[PDB]
Design a protein around this motif. Structure first.
Motif, PDB file in Angstrom:
ATOM      1  N   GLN H  14       0.793  -1.302   0.601  1.00 37.96           N
ATOM      2  CA  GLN H  14      -0.149  -0.295  -0.215  1.00 37.96           C
ATOM      3  C   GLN H  14       0.948   1.389  -0.264  1.00 37.96           C
ATOM      4  O   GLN H  14       1.613   1.217   0.913  1.00 37.96           O
ATOM      5  CB  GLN H  14      -1.194  -0.161   1.313  1.00 37.96           C
ATOM      6  CG  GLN H  14      -2.171   0.838   0.535  1.00 37.96           C
ATOM      7  CD  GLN H  14      -2.101   2.049   0.622  1.00 37.96           C
ATOM      8  OE1 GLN H  14      -1.318   2.729   1.413  1.00 37.96           O
ATOM      9  NE2 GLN H  14      -3.396   2.937   0.249  1.00 37.96           N
ATOM     10  N   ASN H  20      -6.001   2.948   7.810  1.00 40.30           N
ATOM     11  CA  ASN H  20      -6.819   1.326   9.269  1.00 40.30           C
ATOM     12  C   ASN H  20      -7.438   0.180   7.201  1.00 40.30           C
ATOM     13  O   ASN H  20      -7.386  -0.699   7.257  1.00 40.30           O
ATOM     14  CB  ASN H  20      -8.813   1.610   8.360  1.00 40.30           C
ATOM     15  CG  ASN H  20      -8.681   3.434   9.746  1.00 40.30           C
ATOM     16  OD1 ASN H  20      -9.256   3.048  10.815  1.00 40.30           O
ATOM     17  ND2 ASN H  20      -8.564   4.345   8.814  1.00 40.30           N
TER      18      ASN H  20
ATOM     19  N   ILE J  11      -2.238 -11.488  -4.219  1.00 38.77           N
ATOM     20  CA  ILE J  11      -0.755 -10.839  -4.367  1.00 38.77           C
ATOM     21  C   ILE J  11      -1.654  -8.741  -4.889  1.00 38.77           C
ATOM     22  O   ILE J  11      -2.520  -9.208  -5.963  1.00 38.77           O
ATOM     23  CB  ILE J  11       0.369 -10.934  -5.592  1.00 38.77           C
ATOM     24  CG1 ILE J  11       0.910 -11.678  -5.172  1.00 38.77           C
ATOM     25  CG2 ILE J  11       0.350  -9.960  -6.021  1.00 38.77           C
ATOM     26  CD1 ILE J  11       0.677 -13.621  -4.449  1.00 38.77           C
ATOM     27  N   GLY J  12      -1.262  -8.284  -3.492  1.00 36.06           N
ATOM     28  CA  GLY J  12      -2.427  -7.089  -3.879  1.00 36.06           C
ATOM     29  C   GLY J  12      -1.071  -5.720  -3.885  1.00 36.06           C
ATOM     30  O   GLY J  12      -0.938  -5.717  -3.262  1.00 36.06           O
ATOM     31  N   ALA J  13      -1.474  -4.902  -4.908  1.00 34.59           N
ATOM     32  CA  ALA J  13      -0.583  -3.712  -5.311  1.00 34.59           C
ATOM     33  C   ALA J  13      -1.760  -2.399  -5.379  1.00 34.59           C
ATOM     34  O   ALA J  13      -2.362  -2.071  -6.538  1.00 34.59           O
ATOM     35  CB  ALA J  13       0.126  -3.015  -6.701  1.00 34.59           C
ATOM     36  N   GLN J  14      -2.372  -1.448  -4.500  1.00 32.52           N
ATOM     37  CA  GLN J  14      -2.668  -0.199  -4.563  1.00 32.52           C
ATOM     38  C   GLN J  14      -2.145   1.101  -4.136  1.00 32.52           C
ATOM     39  O   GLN J  14      -1.407   1.292  -3.486  1.00 32.52           O
ATOM     40  CB  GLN J  14      -3.370  -0.296  -3.122  1.00 32.52           C
ATOM     41  CG  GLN J  14      -4.563   0.128  -3.345  1.00 32.52           C
ATOM     42  CD  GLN J  14      -4.941   1.798  -2.926  1.00 32.52           C
ATOM     43  OE1 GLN J  14      -4.227   2.530  -2.804  1.00 32.52           O
ATOM     44  NE2 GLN J  14      -5.135   2.305  -3.940  1.00 32.52           N
ATOM     45  N   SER J  15      -2.166   1.884  -5.263  1.00 32.81           N
ATOM     46  CA  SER J  15      -0.841   3.568  -5.332  1.00 32.81           C
ATOM     47  C   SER J  15      -2.541   4.578  -5.222  1.00 32.81           C
ATOM     48  O   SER J  15      -3.455   4.369  -5.736  1.00 32.81           O
ATOM     49  CB  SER J  15       0.063   3.217  -6.279  1.00 32.81           C
ATOM     50  OG  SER J  15       0.355   4.125  -6.526  1.00 32.81           O
ATOM     51  N   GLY J  16      -1.770   5.364  -4.567  1.00 32.33           N
ATOM     52  CA  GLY J  16      -2.985   6.576  -4.638  1.00 32.33           C
ATOM     53  C   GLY J  16      -3.744   6.732  -3.066  1.00 32.33           C
ATOM     54  O   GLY J  16      -2.822   6.938  -1.966  1.00 32.33           O
ATOM     55  N   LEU J  17      -4.990   6.438  -2.846  1.00 31.43           N
ATOM     56  CA  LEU J  17      -5.428   6.429  -1.753  1.00 31.43           C
ATOM     57  C   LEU J  17      -6.814   4.713  -1.826  1.00 31.43           C
ATOM     58  O   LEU J  17      -7.576   4.375  -2.252  1.00 31.43           O
ATOM     59  CB  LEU J  17      -7.246   7.424  -2.081  1.00 31.43           C
ATOM     60  CG  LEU J  17      -6.886   9.216  -2.278  1.00 31.43           C
ATOM     61  CD1 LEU J  17      -8.088   9.692  -1.824  1.00 31.43           C
ATOM     62  CD2 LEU J  17      -5.349   8.847  -1.214  1.00 31.43           C
ATOM     63  N   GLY J  18      -5.339   4.071  -0.382  1.00 27.87           N
ATOM     64  CA  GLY J  18      -6.656   2.773  -0.404  1.00 27.87           C
ATOM     65  C   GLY J  18      -6.764   2.845   1.235  1.00 27.87           C
ATOM     66  O   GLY J  18      -7.116   1.997   1.658  1.00 27.87           O
ATOM     67  N   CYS J  19      -7.267   3.591   1.814  1.00 29.65           N
ATOM     68  CA  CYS J  19      -8.020   3.984   3.067  1.00 29.65           C
ATOM     69  C   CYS J  19      -9.006   2.125   3.183  1.00 29.65           C
ATOM     70  O   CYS J  19      -9.373   1.697   1.919  1.00 29.65           O
ATOM     71  CB  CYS J  19      -8.495   4.391   3.545  1.00 29.65           C
ATOM     72  SG  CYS J  19      -7.539   6.330   3.437  1.00 29.65           S
ATOM     73  N   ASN J  20      -8.527   1.283   4.101  1.00 24.96           N
ATOM     74  CA  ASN J  20      -9.453   0.544   4.883  1.00 24.96           C
ATOM     75  C   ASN J  20      -9.474  -0.060   3.697  1.00 24.96           C
ATOM     76  O   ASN J  20     -10.819  -1.369   3.307  1.00 24.96           O
ATOM     77  CB  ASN J  20     -11.230   0.910   5.010  1.00 24.96           C
ATOM     78  CG  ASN J  20     -11.265   1.763   5.304  1.00 24.96           C
ATOM     79  OD1 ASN J  20     -11.349   1.820   7.012  1.00 24.96           O
ATOM     80  ND2 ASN J  20     -11.023   2.727   4.844  1.00 24.96           N
ATOM     81  N   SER J  21      -8.012  -0.898   3.307  1.00 27.04           N
ATOM     82  CA  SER J  21      -7.659  -1.650   2.169  1.00 27.04           C
ATOM     83  C   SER J  21      -7.164  -3.037   2.917  1.00 27.04           C
ATOM     84  O   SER J  21      -6.531  -2.548   4.097  1.00 27.04           O
ATOM     85  CB  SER J  21      -7.374  -1.086   0.760  1.00 27.04           C
ATOM     86  OG  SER J  21      -8.155  -0.551   0.365  1.00 27.04           O
ATOM     87  N   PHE J  22      -7.221  -3.933   2.245  1.00 30.95           N
ATOM     88  CA  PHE J  22      -5.773  -5.487   2.502  1.00 30.95           C
ATOM     89  C   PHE J  22      -6.282  -5.642   3.716  1.00 30.95           C
ATOM     90  O   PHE J  22      -5.847  -6.024   4.656  1.00 30.95           O
ATOM     91  CB  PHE J  22      -4.809  -4.731   2.154  1.00 30.95           C
ATOM     92  CG  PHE J  22      -4.239  -4.375   1.141  1.00 30.95           C
ATOM     93  CD1 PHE J  22      -3.294  -5.435   0.386  1.00 30.95           C
ATOM     94  CD2 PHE J  22      -4.370  -3.136   0.880  1.00 30.95           C
ATOM     95  CE1 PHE J  22      -3.129  -5.387  -0.874  1.00 30.95           C
ATOM     96  CE2 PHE J  22      -3.381  -2.813  -0.236  1.00 30.95           C
ATOM     97  CZ  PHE J  22      -2.627  -3.718  -1.572  1.00 30.95           C
ATOM     98  N   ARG J  23      -8.108  -6.273   3.913  1.00 27.48           N
ATOM     99  CA  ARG J  23      -9.229  -6.725   5.010  1.00 27.48           C
ATOM    100  C   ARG J  23      -8.740  -7.908   4.853  1.00 27.48           C
ATOM    101  O   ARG J  23      -9.694  -8.266   4.356  1.00 27.48           O
ATOM    102  CB  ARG J  23      -9.487  -5.516   5.134  1.00 27.48           C
ATOM    103  CG  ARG J  23      -9.554  -4.403   6.003  1.00 27.48           C
ATOM    104  CD  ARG J  23     -10.666  -3.909   6.666  1.00 27.48           C
ATOM    105  NE  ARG J  23     -10.912  -4.394   8.042  1.00 27.48           N
ATOM    106  CZ  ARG J  23     -12.250  -3.975   8.633  1.00 27.48           C
ATOM    107  NH1 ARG J  23     -12.866  -2.823   8.413  1.00 27.48           N
ATOM    108  NH2 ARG J  23     -12.437  -4.821   9.986  1.00 27.48           N
ATOM    109  N   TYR J  24      -7.368  -8.745   5.352  1.00 34.21           N
ATOM    110  CA  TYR J  24      -7.347 -10.132   5.450  1.00 34.21           C
ATOM    111  C   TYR J  24      -8.390 -10.415   6.186  1.00 34.21           C
ATOM    112  O   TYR J  24      -8.793 -10.315   7.239  1.00 34.21           O
ATOM    113  CB  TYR J  24      -6.106 -10.578   5.092  1.00 34.21           C
ATOM    114  CG  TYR J  24      -5.414 -10.513   4.395  1.00 34.21           C
ATOM    115  CD1 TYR J  24      -4.762  -9.202   4.619  1.00 34.21           C
ATOM    116  CD2 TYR J  24      -4.798 -11.045   3.399  1.00 34.21           C
ATOM    117  CE1 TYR J  24      -3.121  -8.424   3.464  1.00 34.21           C
ATOM    118  CE2 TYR J  24      -4.458 -10.094   2.191  1.00 34.21           C
ATOM    119  CZ  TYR J  24      -3.406  -9.378   2.075  1.00 34.21           C
ATOM    120  OH  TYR J  24      -2.621  -9.069   1.264  1.00 34.21           O
TER     121      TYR J  24
END
Lengths: 24, 24, 24, 24, 24, 24, 24, 24, 24, 24, 24, 24, 24, 24, 24, 24, 24, 24, 24, 24
Positions: H14, H20, J11-24
């Motif tokens: 990220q 969060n 596999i996850g790539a988040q660029s920019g605004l990634g709030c409340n993400s990658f909740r496994y």
């Protein structure tokens, strides 16, 4: 909570295998 | 809580295997 | 609590295997 | 230089503003 | 330089503003 | 330089504003 | 919670195998 | 430089505003 | 929650095999 | 430079605004 | 009579009226 | 009488009235 | 903290690569 | 903090590659 | 009498009235 | 913080590649 | 008497009245 | 913060490739 | 007396009254 | 923040490729 960001230039995060890295 | 950021330039975080790193 | 950041330049954190590191 | 490494479970590297962190 | 690495389960690298993080 | 790597399960890299993160 | 972003320039996150990286 | 890699299951990167996040 | 973005220039995220990367 | 790669599942790539993400 | 430059980070030249300056 | 430049980051030249300047 | 000045004729400021310079 | 300034004739400022310069 | 330029990031030249400037 | 300024005749500012310049 | 330019990112030249400027 | 300015005759500003320039 | 330009990103030239400018 | 400006005669601004220029 609350998070306010200032000014950031060269912030870097490495997770896992990161040998020979962060050579500023 | 509350977190206010100032000015940051070359902040670096390494987690895991980070040998031979952070060579400023 | 509350945390106010000043000015930071070359802050570095290494967790795990970090031998031969932090060679300023 | 050789980085072999065993079994690593909960490894954390926080750089910068890490208040109220690493609460096990 | 050789990065072999074992079994890694919960590895976290937070860079910048990481307040209230790494709460295991 | 050789990056071999073992079995990796929960690996997280957060860069920038990562408040209230890595809550295992 | 709430997250307000300031100014960011060269924020970088690497997860997995990231050897020989972050060569600012 | 050689990037071999093993078995990778839950890998997250990220960059930017990641509040969060990475809540396992 | 709520996320407000500031100004971002060269934000980069790499997930998986990212060796020899992020050469600013 | 050689990128071989093993078996990659989530596999996850988040660029920019990634709030409340990658909740496994 | 050649010359080769290495790496330079913060170089400053002030000529004339330069009082109250160079506050590193 | 040639010359070759390396890597430069923050270079400043001030000529004349330059008081209260170069505040790194 | 002020600065008034005076008479200035051939003021010269050079930052960086300046070999074989300032020859009067 | 003010600056008045007087008489300026041949003021010269050079940043970067400036070999064989400022020859009076 | 040739010259070759490397990599430049933040180069500044100020001539004349340049007080309260170059605040990196 | 103000700036008045007087008489300026041959003011010169050069940034970047400026070899063999400012020859009076 | 030729010259070759490399890579330039943020280059600034100010001539005359340039107070309170170059605030990187 | 204001700027009044006086008499200016041969002011010159050059950014980038400026070899063999500012010859008075 | 030729010249070749590389890659340029943010180039600025200001001549005359340029106070409170170049705020990168 | 205003700017009044006085007498200007031969003001010159050049950005980019400007070799062999500003010859008075």
């Amino acid at each position: 909570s609350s998070c306010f960001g200032g000014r950031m230039d060269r912030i870097g995060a490495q997770s896992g295998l990161g040998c020979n890295s962060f050579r500023y």
